[PDB]
Amino acid sequence: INTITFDAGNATINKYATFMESLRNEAKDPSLKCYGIPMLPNTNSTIKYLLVKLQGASLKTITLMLRRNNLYVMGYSDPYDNKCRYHIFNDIKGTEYSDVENTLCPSSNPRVAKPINYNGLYPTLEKKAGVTSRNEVQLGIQILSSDIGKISGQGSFTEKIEAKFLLVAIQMVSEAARFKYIENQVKTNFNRDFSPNDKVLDLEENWGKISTAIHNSKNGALPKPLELKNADGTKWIVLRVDEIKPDVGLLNYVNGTCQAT
Numbered sequence: 001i002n003t004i005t006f007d008a009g010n011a012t013i014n015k016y017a018t019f020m021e022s023l024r025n026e027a028k029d030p031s032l033k034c035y036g037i038p039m040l041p042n043t044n045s046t047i048k049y050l051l052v053k054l055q056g057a058s059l060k061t062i063t064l065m066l067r068r069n070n071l072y073v074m075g076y077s078d079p080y081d082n083k084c085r086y087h088i089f090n091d092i093k094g095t096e097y098s099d100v101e102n103t104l105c106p107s108s109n110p111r112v113a114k115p116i117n118y119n120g121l122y123p124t125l126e127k128k129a130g131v132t133s134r135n136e137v138q139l140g141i142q143i144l145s146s147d148i149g150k151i152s153g154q155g156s157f158t159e160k161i162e163a164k165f166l167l168v169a170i171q172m173v174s175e176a177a178r179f180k181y182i183e184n185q186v187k188t189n190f191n192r193d194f195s196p197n198d199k200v201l202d203l204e205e206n207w208g209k210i211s212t213a214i215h216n217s218k219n220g221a222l223p224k225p226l227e228l229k230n231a232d233g234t235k236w237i238v239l240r241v242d243e244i245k246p247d248v249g250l251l252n253y254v255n256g257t258c259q260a261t
């Protein structure tokens with residue numbers, strides 16, 4: 001719907017929380033809740049894309065295309081050598097490739113296609129970034145600002161720098177809007193580059209499950225215990241949604257009626 005823009009060059013903790021609430025406010029389906037939890041809308045909606053513009057300390061920018069139904073990064077842009085440069089993942093083609101390309105790069109302005117030769121799946125990025133897992137790849141507000149300069153406007157960048165760039169951007173924008181916990185981690189360490197602890201990652205790989213448990217779980221009694229992880233790698237066992245509600249920002253779409261309240 002509307003282009004949300006975050007400035008990682010000149011940002012604070014109270015600039016990130018608004019951008020997140022903006023993200024959350026803009027990504028969420030005005031009519032779909034769950035235990036005081038906004039839930040994302042289903043595939044077919046009025047609007048279907050989010051535009052998030054990131055400003056670098058270097059003042060350069062890099063835009064990002066998010067499906068607002070799920071919040072996966074469909075493609076990112078950057079003005080390079082007097083034209084709109086659109087980057088689309090390789091498993092994205094056809095018409096949704098057009099809607100991604102024609103959105104980031106108006107079909108009336110000079111454009112250059114620079115294909116992403118892989119997908120936006122964590123094991124994938126992890127392997128385009130040289131890691132066996134993303135926790136080896138640091139996060140930070142000034143890590144996203146720096147990453148933006150290495151890329152935006154550059155005629156030549158590597159796949160290593162790119163997927164790592166993609167690891168921190170999909171984690172500091174996409175995962176943090178889905179998770180209050182993740183947004184707090186980045187907010188907690190807003191001055192230091194941090195390795196993401198086990199709960200950041202568990203929650204990442206467990207959104208579909210958590211959103212689903214919270215959905216059909218009356219009175220606050222999830223359907224069956226939920227196995228997660230605390231920050232320290234130990235096992236966490238959720239039973240009631242007001243238990244794992246704090247950490248949740250947005251709920252994935254789950255067809256039907258869940259306790260609105």
Ligand SMILES: *[C@@H]1O[C@H](CO)[C@@H](O)[C@H](O)[C@H]1NC(C)=O
Nearest residue numbers: 007009010011012014015057
């Ligand atoms: C950052 O934004 C503040 C206001 O939020 C502004 O006063 C300041 O000049 C900006 N910093 C720059 C431009 O280096």
Ligand SMILES: *[C@@H]1O[C@H](CO)[C@@H](O)[C@H](O)[C@H]1NC(C)=O
Nearest residue numbers: 042215216254255256257258
């Ligand atoms: C979800 O989709 C099915 C598909 O036919 C539809 O019939 C159903 O009413 C929707 N809601 C639920 C709770 O299944």
Ligand SMILES: *[C@H]1O[C@H](CO)[C@@H](O)[C@H](O)[C@H]1NC(C)=O
Nearest residue numbers: 041042043044045046047048
């Ligand atoms: C929305 O997409 C089209 C609308 O032209 C149609 O298939 C249907 O209304 C929706 N599609 C699905 C898969 O629900």
